[PDB]
Design a protein around this ligand. Structure first.
Ligand SMILES: [Mg+2]
Ligand SMILES: [Zn+2]
Ligand SMILES: [Zn+2]
Lengths: 99, 1327, 359
RNA sequence: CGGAGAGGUA
DNA sequence: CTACCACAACGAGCTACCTCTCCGCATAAGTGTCAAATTTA
DNA sequence: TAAATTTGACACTATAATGGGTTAACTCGTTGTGGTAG
C-alpha cells in the first residue's frame, strides 16, 4: 500500500489510517525517539508539522514541491490547539505566553 | 506566534467570560427537518460562527464581497468556517459548584488549604451537614461542622449572630473570607515551637501551598466553579454517517445533561420550590458537572446507551489513547508507504530496491513539478491524468527524480536508534522492498513475512540530514558499545569458514604458487580443491609511523581458500588475519581491525566484497543437512542403562528405609545430570573428529567435515545445546511449578519421542512462549521510563575543567576477571595522571582521550587502575561538557557538542531487555599462638596480586576467620588460605592468661546446663528476651583478664578489654583454662529484568541492611524490650543520634568494637539511599553500575558503563537543603541541585554565607514527575495530578527539553538545530 | 445515619421517608388552611382602595370588549350589572371619602361583595406584586430614614421609633426630635434637607395611597401572614405526597431520563396539582394529583429524552405507531409492512407520510 | 473519516 | 503525645499493521384552542 | 405581501392508585487515614 495525499480526519485533522480508506503510516513514539537520538531535527519537524495535521503547512508543501522548490514553512499543529481548547474547557487557564 | 513560554494559571470567572463570544442556553443541538443549527444551542451559529465559508444561514450575504459583517437577520458573522474550531461559549451556572480536580485529586488542595478533612468537605458538598463560615460568639468557631439538629438548635438560639451555610456556596464563602498571608505567617510562627515529623510534614506542605497561592496571584475562591466554558463545536462534532444516522461525541451528551439540569434549577428557583427539591437539584447539578470534568472519579461513572462509561474531557486529555501520547508525540504522516521485504544480494550497503508503483505514488508532487518544468504538461490536472495512465516518459522522469534522493526505511518496534535508516533507492519491478543482507542485524529483521515502512524527505535540509547523518554507510559501529553492527550472518560466515578451512590430502597438496591469482585460476580450473595445503607468495603492506604503506614479500603456508580471500583484503592488513579458519568472531575482528586501521570507506568496500564472496562460495560449497548428519553416539544406550540401574538401586535403597525422599530426589537429579553430561560429551567427541579417513601420511585424524558440526562450530546457526538436544539427549525438563521432574527425556529428536516425553516438553515450550511476550512488554515500559528520565540531557560545553572522577578498576568478583581494564577504560578521558613507579613509570597527562594505542600502552606498562572524569561528577549546569562524556562510541572520536546523550543511553540500556602474592587490605588483626592469623575487622579483604602487580582474585573473610599467610608473602597457587567455620562465628579475644567469671551468675543472666556434645559444664548466656527481672539491666561480659584477675586493657587506648557478649550464645569455655591471644572462646551462629527495574527506580529492599551513620563506639541504650536501641556515641563529641533495631533481625557487629562512617551492622541488601547519604555520590554510582552490569553480563550482553552513569546522574537531580543561608529556601525543599549550585556560586561571588544541601536519590518515575517542566510530566504520566499542581502553583515552562519542542512543533535543541536555539537564546539574552 | 453514602436517590429517599402519610381528613384540613390563607390575603388586598380603583378601570376597559369576560372572572348579562353596582359603590365612596366610619363600612362591604369574585391568578398576582413593589418602595423610604437616624448620632432606636410610629408624615416629628436638646439632637440639622426630600417622598406615597403609613403597614402585614400560612400549608401538602410521585415515576424508567429527573418533574407536577386541588368535590387528593404528575412526567420525557428534540405531536404519533405495530405483529405473527400500517393507521396518513414519520 | 467487540500477522 | 501497623484508594502495564461486524434494542393514554413559520400567485 | 395550512406550544383530564433495579465480586507500589496501646 502507498499514499501521497488523501483525506483527513475531522477533530485532529491528520491523515486517516487504513489501506481500505487510503491512510498514511503512523510515526509512533519510538521512531520519534530514534530520530531524536540521531539528532535529526529537520526530518522530525517535517514529519511533525508539514506532513501531518497542519492544514496550511501541508498545502504549502504541495504547492512548493509542485513548483520544484524544496523548502518548509512550519506552523502550529492542530492537535495542540485541540488540547488547549480541551484543557480550557476543563476550567484551567492555559495560554501560550509570548516571551 | 513566536513565544518563549507556556504559562499555566487558574481561570477567573471574568476571564472565562472573556474567552467566550456568547452564552449557550438551550439543550437542542440542531434541527432535523433541515440540518441547520439552532439558536443558542450547542452548535448555534451566532455564537460559534457560520457553518460555511463566507455565508449566512438565511442565505442573505453569500460571497466574499462582504468579507466581514454581521447579518441583522440571523446575527451570524460572515467569516470563514475555521472560526468554528476556535470560539468558546459559556454556561452561567445558577448554584456555584466545586471543581473536581481541586477536590478529589489527592492531596485535596482544598482540605489541605482550609485545614479540613476531605470527608467533612464532601459531607458539606453532598448537602448532608451545615458548616459555619463566621460567628461573633466564641461558641461557634470557623469551620465547625454541625448536623441538621445542631443547626436548628443554634438557629433557634442565636439566629442572627452566626452564619452557617450548606453546599458548595458555603465552601466558596469560606475560601473567600480566608486570608492567605495571615495564615501563612501564623503557621510560620507555629512551625517553630515543636517539630513532630508527621506534623512538620503537614505544616510544611500547607505552607508551600499557601506561598504558592501568594506568589502565583491566584485567588482561593477560583476553584469554586461559577461559569462553565464551552468547547467549540468542531472539536465535539455531530457528523452524519453513510447510513444517514449521526455519530456524535459524548461531550454533547454531557453538555446536554449539565444545561438541562441548570435550566431546571433556574426554573425551580424562580418557582419557589421546597428546600428539599432545590437541594436535590443542586446535588444533581454538581454530579452533572463533575461527570463532565471526569466521569469515573467521584462515584459511579455515568454510562451512555451501550452501557459503557462516557468519555469526559479528562479522558480525552490523559491516558494511552489521549491527546498527548496519540496526537502530539506520534502522528500520522503523509508520503508514506508500507510493504513486505525480500532479500537483495546484488545491492550495496547504501542501496534499497524500491518497487515502481510505490515510487510513482510517493514522488507524485515531484513528478508533477518536473513534468511541468520540462513542458510536457500545461496544468496540474494534465500531469495528474498523465501519471494516472503511466506513460513511459513518466517512468523516465521518475528515474530522473529519484536519482540521489535518499528515503527512510523503518521497522517497528524501533528498539534502538538503528531501527530507521536512509538508503538510496533503485527502481525494481515487483511489489517488495529489497533490503541489503548485512543491515538485517541492525533491523533485527527476518525474511519470514516481515514488513516495513518507507518515508520520503522533502526539503533540502532533510535530504542532507539523511545523507550525512542517517546513511547506512555512516552508522557502522553500534552506539551502545564500540563494535561493528554490519557483520556477516549465518551464510557469509559459513562460506568463509568452508573457504579458509584446510583438509589433509584434498587435491594437489604440497603445491607452490606465484600469488593468489594463480590459486583462483587453479580452483576455477579444477586441478586443486579449496582445502589443499599449499605454499603461496604473499606481498603484504604494513603501516609505518606515518600514513604511507611499506611492502614486504615472502612465502606462507596457506590453503587455496586463504589465498583466494587475500584478493579481497585491502592493502594495510597483516596476513595473520586470513591464515586461520574464520568464524563469526574472526570476521568481526577482521572488520574492527580494518575500521581502526584504514577508516570508513575501505571498510565499507571490504564488507561488500566479503559478503559477495561468502554468498558465492557458500552456494558453490553445496553444504546440506541430512538424516545421517545427526550421528547418534554409539555409547548412549550403555550410559542410559547404567543410569537407569543406578536410579533403580537408589529407589530400592530408599524403599528399604535408609535415606529420606528429598535427598533421594536430589540424588537422582544429580545422577541424571551426570548421565546427560556424559552423553553430551561422548556425542560431541564423536561428531567433532569424524573425519578419520585420511591419506598420504597414514590414517590421520582431523576436524570433521560434518554439516551439523560445520554450522555449530563456525557460529553460523545454533550452539552446543541445540546439537545436544538434536543428536544426544534431550535432558531434564522442569515442571510448571519450577521443580525438575525426576525421570528425564532420554530420546532425542532423531529417534522420535513417545507420547509422555512430548507432553512433558510442552510445558517448557508454552512457558517460554508466554515469557517472551511478558518480558517484551516489561522491557517496553522500562525503555519508555528511561527515555523520559534522560530526555533533556544535551552536551553543551566542551570542557568544564573539573578534577573529580571515578576510579576505574577491573572487576574481580569471583575467581576471574569479568572485564579487564581495557574494556573499562577505552574511550574515557583521564581525570588525573597515572603516578606509579611500576616498571616504566608511564605518565599520561590530564585531559587525554585514551585511544586504542593509549590503552595498549597502559596494558604493556601494567597499570592497575586509572581515575577518569565521569558524567555524574561533571560541573556543568543544565547539561554536561564534552570531555566528561569521553568518546562517541558510534563514531570513534570525541563527541560533538549538541548531541543528545540521554536518548542514546536510554535506548542502549533498554534495547537488550528482550534478551534477559597475597595482599590484605584494611586490616586490623592479632597474632595467635600457632601462626594461624585471625582478623578482628569486618571490611578486610584479601586480594591475590601477581608478581607483575595485577590483582587476580579477591575474597572477604568473616569476623574471626583464620588464615596462615600474612601480608608480603608469595604463596603458590592451589594453597587453601581461606579457612573458617562456615555456619558459626567466634568471639575471639586479644589478651592471654586465665579467665575469671565476672558479672554472670547462674539463674538470671546465664543458664545452668551441660553441653550435649562434650559433656562439659558450660555457662551459656540466655537471651535478654527471655531473662527474668534481674537480668533486665546488666550486660554479661566475659571479662578476659590476666593470670590473677585484673581486667587488662587493650594496648593503644585506655578502654579495658571486656566483651559484652550477646544472647543466644552456646558459650563452651569455662573457668580455670588457658586462653591465648586471638583464639576462639565460643561459637555464635550468624530475575534479570525485574532486578534492573528495581535498581533503576530504587526500591528500599524488603530486608534493609543497617549502616553506621556516625563514627564512634557502639552501645545499647534501651532495655526490657526486644527492639534494641543503639547509642553510637562519638569518641570526641556528644551523641545526638540513636538507632532502633527490631527483634528478629540478626546483628553482625557486637557492642565491643568501634565502627567508622559507613559500616555494615546488619547483613543483607543495601538500600541505595543510605549508601548515597553516607558514603558519597561516587559510591552509589559505582554500586548501581556494578549491579546493572552483573545482570547484563550474566546473559552475555555488552553495554558501556557511561550510559548507566548518565542515568544515575539524571537520578540525582534533586537536593534537599539541610541548612539555609540567605537564599529563598526555607528547609527540606527537594529543589533542583543546579539551582542551589548557581545560587551558591553567585552568593559566594558577592561574598555571603551560602547554603548547604544534601542530594537525594529518587526513582526514575519520581524524578521524571518532579521535573521542572510540567508539559513533559503531563505527557509522561499522571496528567491530572501534574496539571493540577502546575495550575495551583502558577508555574511556567521555558521550553528547554527535546520533548517540549517536539510537542509544540519547533526544532529540538540537539544536533543540527542546536546552534539555531543557541542563536535564538543569544538574541533573547542580548536584547 | 448521615454517613458513608453517595447515591443521590438513596439520600433523597432518606429525607423523604421522615414524613408520615395523610389520612382521608388530614388532606381536608390542609386544604382548608390553604383556602383560608388564600381568602385572607384576597380580603387583605381587597380593602386597599387603589386596588379597587385598578380593578374598576380594568372592568371598565373590558366592558369596552377589548377582551373576553371569561378571561378575568373564572366563576363565583350578569358581569355588566355587577360591574355597574361596584362602580356605584365606588362613586358613593368617592362622595364619602373622609365623611367618617361609613367610608370604612363601604370599603369593607366592597371587600365582602368581592369575596365571591373568583378571578384569574394572573391579575391577582399582578395586584399582589404591585402591593409588594410599593410596599418595598416605602420600606426603602423608612430604611433610608433609619440610615439617616443612626449614621451620625449613635442614638437609641426606641425614642426615634416612638416618634416615628405616630405621624411620620409632616416635619413636626423631625423638629420635635430636634427640640429635645439631646447632644446628638442638634447635630441632625446637617441632614435636614435630605430627610425633607424623604418626608415629601413618602408623602407622595401617601397621596398615591390615600391612607396613612400605619394602615398600609397593617394591611401588608395581614397580606404577609396570610401568604405565609398559605405557603406553609402548601408545603406540608406537597412534601407529604412524595411517595406518590416516586410510585408514578418508577414506571417510566429507562426511556431517556434518569430516575431522579423523573422524580423532580413529578414533584413539579405535584406542586401544580396542590395549587389546583379543590377538596369540596369530595374526592381523594391522589386521584386528582395522579393526572397532573403523569402529564408532567410524560411531557418532560417528550422534550429532553433524546439528543434531538422532537415535538410532542410527533412523539404521540410515533407511539400511535409503536402500539399499532406491536398489535399487528401480535395479530399476524410477523412485523408489519408500511402499506399495512398505512391501511390500519389513519384516514389522512399514507405510505409517504409515515415513511417520513420514521425518523 | 468515529467508537466498541471478535479474529489474524510480525 | 506521638512512633506504629493495617486497611482502603489510585494509577500503571511494547509497537506497528490487516480483516470482519455492530451502535436511536422489552415496556407509552388521547383532546383543544391559540400562535406561527413554511407554502401558492 | 395577503392568505392557507400543517406545525408547534400550552392547558387541561376528578373512583383509587403511597419506598427502585443491579452489576459483576490479576499484581504492585504509594498515600492517607483510623485507630492502638502503654
Ligand atoms: Mg519476522
Ligand atoms: Zn443567512
Ligand atoms: Zn563529568
Amino acid at each position: 500500500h502507498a499514499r501521497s495525499t488523501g483525506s483527513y480526519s475531522l477533530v485532529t485533522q491528520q491523515p486517516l489510517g487504513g489501506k481500505a480508506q487510503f491512510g498514511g503510516q503512523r510515526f509512533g513514539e519510538m521512531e520519534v525517539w530514534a530520530l531524536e537520538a540521531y539528532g535529526a531535527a529537520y526530518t522530525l519537524q517535517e514529519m511533525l508539522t508539514v506532513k501531518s495535521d497542519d492544514v496550511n503547512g501541508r498545502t504549502k508543501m504541495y504547492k512548493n514541491i509542485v513548483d520544484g522548490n524544496h523548502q518548509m514553512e512550519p506552523g502550529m499543529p492542530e492537535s495542540f490547539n485541540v488540547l488547549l481548547k480541551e484543557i480550557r474547557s476543563l476550567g484551567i487557564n492555559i495560554e501560550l505566553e509570548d516571551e | 506566534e513566536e513565544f518563549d513560554a507556556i504559562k499555566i494559571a487558574l481561570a477567573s470567572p471574568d476571564m472565562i467570560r472573556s474567552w467566550s463570544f456568547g452564552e449557550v442556553k438551550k439543550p437542542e443541538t440542531i434541527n432535523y427537518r433541515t440540518f441547520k443549527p439552532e439558536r443558542d444551542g450547542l452548535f448555534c451559529a451566532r455564537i460559534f460562527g457560520p457553518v460555511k465559508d463566507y455565508e449566512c444561514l438565511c442565505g442573505k450575504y453569500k460571497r466574499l464581497k462582504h468579507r466581514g459583517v454581521i447579518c441583522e437577520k440571523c446575527g451570524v458573522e460572515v467569516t470563514q468556517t475555521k472560526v468554528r474550531r476556535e470560539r468558546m461559549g459559556h454556561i452561567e451556572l445558577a448554584s456555584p459548584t466545586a471543581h473536581i480536580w481541586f477536590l478529589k485529586s489527592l492531596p485535596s488542595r482544598i482540605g489541605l488549604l482550609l485545614d479540613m478533612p476531605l470527608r467533612d468537605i464532601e459531607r458539606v458538598l453532598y448537602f448532608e451537614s451545615y458548616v459555619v463560615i463566621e460567628g461573633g460568639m466564641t461558641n461557634l468557631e470557623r469551620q465547625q461542622i454541625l448536623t441538621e439538629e445542631q443547626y436548628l438548635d443554634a438557629l433557634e438560639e442565636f439566629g442572627d449572630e452566626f452564619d452557617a451555610k450548606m453546599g458548595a456556596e458555603a465552601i466558596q464563602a469560606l475560601l473567600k473570607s480566608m486570608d492567605l498571608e495571615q495564615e501563612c505567617e501564623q503557621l510560620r510562627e507555629e512551625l517553630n515551637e515543636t517539630n513532630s515529623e508527621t506534623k512538620r510534614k503537614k505544616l510544611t506542605k500547607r505552607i508551600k501551598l499557601l506561598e504558592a497561592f501568594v506568589q502565583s496571584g491566584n485567588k482561593p475562591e477560583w476553584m469554586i466553579l461559577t461559569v462553565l466554558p464551552v468547547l467549540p463545536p468542531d472539536l465535539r462534532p455531530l457528523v452524519p454517517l453513510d447510513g444517514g444516522r449521526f455519530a456524535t461525541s459524548d461531550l454533547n451528551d454531557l453538555y446536554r445533561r449539565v444545561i438541562n439540569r441548570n435550566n431546571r434549577l433556574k426554573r425551580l428557583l424562580d418557582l419557589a420550590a421546597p428546600d428539599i427539591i432545590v437541594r436535590n437539584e443542586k446535588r444533581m447539578l454538581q454530579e452533572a458537572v463533575d461527570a463532565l470534568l471526569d466521569n469515573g472519579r467521584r462515584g459511579r461513572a455515568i454510562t451512555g446507551s451501550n452501557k459503557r462509561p462516557l468519555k469526559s474531557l479528562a479522558d480525552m486529555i490523559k491516558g494511552k489513547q489521549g491527546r498527548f501520547r496519540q496526537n502530539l508525540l506520534g502522528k500520522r504522516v503523509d508520503y508514506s508507504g508500507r510493504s513486505v521485504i525480500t532479500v537483495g544480494p546484488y545491492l550495496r550497503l547504501h542501496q534499497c530496491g524500491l518497487p515502481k508503483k510505490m515510487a510513482l505514488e510517493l514522488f507524485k508532487p515531484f513528478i508533477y513539478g518536473k513534468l511541468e518544468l520540462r513542458g510536457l504538461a500545461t496544468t496540474i490536472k494534465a500531469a495528474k491524468k498523465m501519471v494516472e495512465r503511466e506513460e513511459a516518459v513518466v517512468w523516465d522522469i521518475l528515474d530522473e527524480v529519484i536519482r540521489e534522493h535518499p528515503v527512510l526505511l523503518n521497522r517497528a518496534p524501533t528498539l534502538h536508534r538503528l531501527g530507521i535508516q536512509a538508503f538510496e533507492p533503485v527502481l525494481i519491478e515487483g511489489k517488495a522492498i529489497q533490503l541489503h543482507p548485512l543491515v538485517c542485524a541492525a533491523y533485527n529483521a527476518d525474511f519470514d513475512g516481515d514488513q516495513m515502512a518507507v518515508h520520503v524527505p522533502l526539503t533540502l535540509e532533510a535530504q542532507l540530514e539523511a545523507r550525512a547523518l542517517m546513511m547506512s554507510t555512516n552508522n557502522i559501529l553500534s552506539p551502545a558499545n564500540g563494535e561493528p553492527i554490519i557483520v556477516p550472518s549465518q551464510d557469509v560466515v559459513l562460506g568463509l569458514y568452508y573457504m579458509t578451512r584446510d583438509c589433509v590430502n584434498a587435491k594437489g597438496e604440497g603445491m607452490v604458487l606465484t600469488g593468489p591469482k594463480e590459486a583462483e585460476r587453479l580452483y576455477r580450473s579444477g586441478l586443486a580443491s579449496l582445502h589443499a595445503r599449499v605454499k603461496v607468495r604473499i606481498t603484504e603492506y604494513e603501516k609505518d609511523a606515518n600514513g604511507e604503506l611499506v611492502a614486504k614479500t615472502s612465502l606462507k603456508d596457506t590453503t587455496v581458500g586463504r589465498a583466494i580471500l587475500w584478493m579481497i583484503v585491502p592493502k594495510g592488513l597483516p596476513y595473520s588475519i586470513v591464515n586461520q579458519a574464520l568464524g563469526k568472531k574472526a570476521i568481526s575482528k577482521m572488520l574492527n581491525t580494518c575500521y581502526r586501521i584504514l577508516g570508513l570507506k575501505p571498510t565499507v568496500i571490504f564488507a561488500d566484497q566479503i559478503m559477495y564472496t561468502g554468498f558465492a562460495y557458500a552456494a558453490r560449497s553445496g553444504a546440506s543437512v541430512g538424516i545421517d548428519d545427526m550421528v547418534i553416539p554409539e555409547k548412549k544406550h550403555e550410559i542410559i542403562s547404567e543410569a537407569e540401574a543406578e536410579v533403580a538401586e537408589i529407589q530400592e535403597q530408599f524403599q528399604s528405609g535408609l535415606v529420606t525422599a528429598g535427598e533421594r530426589y536430589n540424588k537422582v537429579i544429580d545422577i541424571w545430570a551426570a548421565a546427560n553430561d556424559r552423553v553430551s560429551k561422548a556425542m560431541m567427541d564423536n561428531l567433532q573428529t569424524e573425519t578419520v579417513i585420511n591419506r598420504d601420511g597414514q590414517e590421520e585424524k582431523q576436524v570433521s567435515f560434518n554439516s551439523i558440526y560445520m554450522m555449530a562450530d563456525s557460529g553460523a546457526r545454533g550452539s552446543a545445546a541445540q546439537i545436544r538436544q538434536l543428536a544426544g539427549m534431550r535432558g531434564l525438563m522442569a515442571k510448571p511449578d519450577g521443580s525438575i521432574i525426576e525421570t528425564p527425556i532420554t530420546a532425542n529428536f532423531r529417534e522420535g519421542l513417545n507420547v509422555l516425553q512430548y507432553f512433558i516438553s510442552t510445558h517448557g515450550a508454552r512457558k517460554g512462549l508466554a515469557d517472551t511476550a511478558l518480558k517484551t512488554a516489561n522491557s517496553g515500559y522500562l525503555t519508555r521510563r528511561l527515555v523520559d528520565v534522560a530526555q533533556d540531557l544535551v552536551v553543551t560545553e566542551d570542557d568544564c575543567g573539573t578534577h573529580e572522577g571515578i576510579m576505574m578498576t577491573p572487576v574481580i568478583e569471583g575467581g576471574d576477571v569479568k572485564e579487564p581494564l581495557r574494556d573499562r577504560v577505552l574511550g574515557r578521558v583521564t581525570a588525573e595522571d597515572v603516578l606509579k613507579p611500576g616498571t616504566a613509570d608511564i605518565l599520561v597527562p590530564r585531559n587525554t582521550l585514551l585511544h586504542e594505542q593509549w590503552c595498549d600502552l597502559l596494558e604493556e606498562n601494567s597499570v592497575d587502575a586509572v581515575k577518569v572524569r565521569s558524567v555524574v561528577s561533571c560541573d556543568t549546569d543544565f547539561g554536561v561538557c564534552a570531555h566528561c562524556y569521553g568518546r562517541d562510541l558510534a563514531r570513534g572520536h570525541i563527541i560533538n557538542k549538541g548531541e543528545a546523550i540521554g536518548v542514546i543511553a536510554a535506548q542502549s540500556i533498554g534495547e537488550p531487555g528482550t534478551q534477559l602474592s597475597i595482599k590484605l587490605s584494611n586490616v586490623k588483626s592479632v597474632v595467635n599462638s600457632s601462626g594461624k592469623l585471625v582478623i578482628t575487622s569486618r571490611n578486610t579483604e584479601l586480594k591475590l596480586i601477581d608478581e607483575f602487580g595485577r590483582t587476580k582474585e579477591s575474597y572477604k573473610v568473616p569476623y574471626g576467620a583464620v588464615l596462615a599467610k600474612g601480608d608480603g608473602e608469595q604463596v603458590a597457587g592451589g594453597e587453601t588460605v581461606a579457612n573458617w567455620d562456615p555456619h558459626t562465628m567466634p568471639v575471639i579475644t586479644e589478651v592471654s592468661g586465665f579467665v575469671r567469671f565476672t558479672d554472670m551468675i547462674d539463674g538470671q543472666t546465664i543458664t545452668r546446663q551441660t553441653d550435649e556434645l562434650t559433656g562439659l559444664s558450660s555457662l551459656v548466656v540466655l537471651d535478654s528476651a527471655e531473662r527474668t527481672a534481674g537480668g533486665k539491666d546488666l550486660r554479661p561480659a566475659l571479662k578476659i583478664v590476666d593470670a590473677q584477675g585484673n581486667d587488662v586493657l587493650i594496648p593503644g587506648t585506655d578502654m579495658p578489654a571486656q566483651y559484652f557478649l550477646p544472647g543466644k550464645a552456646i558459650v563452651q569455655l569455662e573457668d580455670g583454662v588457658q586462653i591465648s591471644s586471638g583464639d576462639t572462646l565460643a561459637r555464635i551462629p550468624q530475575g534479570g529484568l525485574p532486578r534492573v527495574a528495581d535498581l533503576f527506580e530504587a526500591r528500599r529492599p524488603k530486608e534493609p541492611a543497617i549502616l553506621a551513620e556516625i563514627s564512634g563506639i557502639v552501645s545499647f541504650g534501651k532495655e526490657t524490650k526486644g527492639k534494641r536501641r543503639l547509642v553510637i556515641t562519638p569518641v570526641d563529641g556528644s551523641d545526638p543520634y540513636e538507632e532502633m533495631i527490631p527483634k528478629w533481625r540478626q546483628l553482625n557487629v557486637f557492642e565491643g568494637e568501634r565502627v567508622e562512617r559507613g559500616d555494615v551492622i546488619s547483613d543483607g541488601p543495601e538500600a541505595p539511599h543510605d549508601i548515597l547519604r553516607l558514603r558519597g555520590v561516587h559510591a552509589v554510582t559505582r554500586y548501581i553500575v556494578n549491579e546493572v552490569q552483573d545482570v547484563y553480563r550474566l546473559q552475555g550482553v555488552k553495554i558501556n558503563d557511561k550510559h548507566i552513569e548518565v542515568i544515575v546522574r539524571q537520578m540525582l537531580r534533586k537536593a534537599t537543603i539541610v541548612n539555609a543561608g540567605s537564599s529563598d529556601f526555607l528547609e527540606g525543599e527537594q529543589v533542583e541541585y543546579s539551582r542551589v549550585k548557581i545560587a551558591n556560586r553567585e552568593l559566594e561571588a558577592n561574598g555571603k554565607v551560602g547554603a548547604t544541601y544534601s542530594r537525594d536519590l529518587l526513582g526514575i518515575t519520581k524524578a521524571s514527575l518532579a521535573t521542572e517542566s510540567f508539559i513533559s510530566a503531563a505527557s509522561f504520566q499522571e496528567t491530572t495530578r501534574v496539571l493540577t499542581e502546575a495550575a495551583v502553583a502558577g508555574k511556567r515552562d521555558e521550553l528547554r527539553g527535546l520533548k517540549e519542542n517536539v510537542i509544540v512543533g519547533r526544532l529540538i535543541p540537539a544536533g543540527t538545530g542546536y546552534a539555531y536555539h543557541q542563536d535564538r537564546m543569544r538574541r533573547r539574552a542580548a536584547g | 445515619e448521615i454517613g458513608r453514602t453517595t447515591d443521590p436517590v438513596r439520600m433523597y429517599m432518606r429525607e423523604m421517608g421522615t414524613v408520615e402519610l395523610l389520612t382521608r381528613e388530614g388532606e381536608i384540613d390542609i386544604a382548608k388552611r390553604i383556602e383560608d390563607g388564600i381568602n385572607q390575603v384576597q380580603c387583605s388586598v381587597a380593602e386597599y382602595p387603589e386596588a379597587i380603583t385598578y380593578l374598576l378601570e380594568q372592568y371598565d376597559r373590558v366592558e369596552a370588549e377589548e377582551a373576553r369576560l371569561s378571561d378575568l372572572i373564572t366563576g363565583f348579562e350578569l358581569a355588566r350589572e355587577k360591574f355597574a353596582e361596584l362602580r356605584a359603590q365606588y362613586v358613593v365612596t368617592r362622595d364619602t371619602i373622609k365623611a367618617h366610619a361609613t367610608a370604612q363600612e363601604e370599603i369593607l362591604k366592597l371587600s365582602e361583595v368581592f369575596k365571591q369574585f373568583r378571578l384569574v391568578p394572573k391579575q391577582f398576582d399582578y395586584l399582589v406584586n404591585s402591593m409588594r413593589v410599593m410596599m418595598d418602595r416605602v420600606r426603602t423610604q423608612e430604611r433610608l430614614i433609619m440610615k439617616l437616624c443612626v449614621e451620625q448620632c449613635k442614638m437609641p432606636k426606641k425614642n426615634f421609633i416612638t416618634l416615628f410610629t405616630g405621624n411620620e408624615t409632616s416635619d413636626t416629628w423631625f423638629n420635635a426630635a430636634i427640640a429635645m436638646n439631646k447632644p446628638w439632637s442638634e447635630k441632625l440639622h446637617d441632614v435636614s434637607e435630605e430627610v425633607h426630600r424623604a418626608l415629601q417622598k413618602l408623602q407622595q406615597i401617601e397621596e398615591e395611597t390615600g391612607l396613612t403609613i400605619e394602615q398600609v403597614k397593617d394591611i401588608n402585614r395581614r397580606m404577609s401572614i396570610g401568604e405565609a400560612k398559605a405557603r406553609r400549608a402548601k408545603k406540608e401538602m406537597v412534601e407529604a405526597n412524595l411517595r406518590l410521585v416516586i410510585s408514578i415515576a418508577k414506571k417510566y424508567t429507562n426511556r431517556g431520563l434518569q430516575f431522579l429527573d423523573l422524580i423532580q418533574e413529578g414533584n413539579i407536577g405535584l406542586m401544580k396539582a396542590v395549587d389546583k386541588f379543590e377538596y369540596r368535590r369530595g374526592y381523594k387528593f391522589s386521584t386528582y394529583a395522579t393526572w397532573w404528575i403523569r402529564q408532567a412526567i410524560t411531557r418532560s420525557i417528550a422534550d429532553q429524552a433524546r439528543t434531538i428534540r422532537i415535538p410532542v405531536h410527533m412523539i404521540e404519533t410515533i407511539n400511535k405507531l409503536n402500539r399499532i405495530s406491536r398489535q399487528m405483529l401480535q395479530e399476524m405473527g410477523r412485523e408489519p409492512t408500511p402499506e399495512e400500517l398505512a391501511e390500519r393507521m389513519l384516514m389522512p396518513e399514507d405510505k409517504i407520510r409515515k415513511v417520513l414519520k420514521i425518523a
